[PDB]
Curated annotation (Swiss-Prot):
Signal peptide: none annotated. Changing residue 160 to A: Slight reduction in methyltransferase activity. This is N(6)-adenosine-methyltransferase catalytic subunit METTL3. Disulfide bonds: none annotated. Changing residue 154 to A: Abolishes methyltransferase activity. Changing residue 172 to A: Slight reduction in methyltransferase activity. Strong reduction in methyltransferase activity.
Length: 198
């Protein structure tokens, strides 16, 4: 069901098996550099979410290495790395050895995805910093062109992240808003009283 959908939850505890399979996963984790310990990141049930497709994993500091570890543990191979060059409104550029002009997003592949439009965008994003920790909306356009019309899931998103074709998970969203019939049914079965606990 195309319009935006979301679930307020602790991603550590939600049974993500009810959600189905997704062509694209995006995660912007609170790396321990509401944070998650390294072991909790490792233990996230990312493997059930996809059979063939792509993972986009934002990283920084030592999560550049830790994120590669999770990516590989979850069953992915890193095949690209997007950098977002942060600018102001005049298109000028906005870790203790160098000043940081960029954020990194690892791209991992699982299985053998077919029908994706690889090569349409390049791996550099130039976009204005909106707010603190707010990723650029350009990433959704790149992902939509890469995999048009397919179903997608974002982990650790905020209300401003919700998008059509996307299911957004995060503990700062407002309630549960699910419209896909298969998802609603499996959610009701797993969560008859509408509460997520362990
Ligand atoms: C360079 C990259 C890395 C950079 N990212 C940094 C970033 C900064 C903010 C957010 C963020 O604020 N997310 C909303 C939030 O709700 C916050 C609350 C925690 N989060 C949970 C946690 C949870 N369970 C465990 C748990 C453990 C203890 C207590 C509660 C829960 N389940 C669901 N959500 C998520 C996300 C990423 C932004 C970039 C991309 C551009 C720069």
């Amino acid at each position: 069901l195309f319009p935006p959908q979301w679930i307020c939850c602790d991603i550590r505890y939600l049974d993500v098996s009810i959600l189905g399979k997704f062509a694209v996963v995006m995660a912007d984790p609170p790396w321990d550099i509401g944070t998650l310990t390294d072991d909790e990141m490792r233990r996230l049930n990312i493997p059930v979410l996809q059979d063939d497709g792509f993972l986009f994993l934002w990283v920084t500091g030592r999560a550049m290495e830790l994120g590669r570890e999770c990516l590989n543990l979850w069953g992915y191979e890193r095949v690209d790395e997007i950098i977002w060059v942060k600018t102001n409104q005049l298109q000028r550029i906005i870790g203790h050895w160098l000043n940081h002009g960029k954020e990194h997003c690892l791209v991992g592949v699982k299985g053998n995805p077919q029908g994706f439009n690889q090569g349409l965008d390049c791996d550099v994003i130039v976009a204005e910093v909106r707010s603190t920790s707010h990723k650029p909306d350009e990433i959704y356009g790149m992902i939509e062109r890469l995999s048009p019309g397919t179903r997608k899931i974002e982990l650790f998103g905020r209300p401003h992240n919700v998008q059509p074709n996307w299911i957004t998970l995060g503990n700062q969203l407002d309630g549960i808003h699910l419209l896909d019939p298969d998802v609603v049914a499996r959610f009701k079965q797993r969560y008859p009283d509408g509460i997520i606990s362990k």
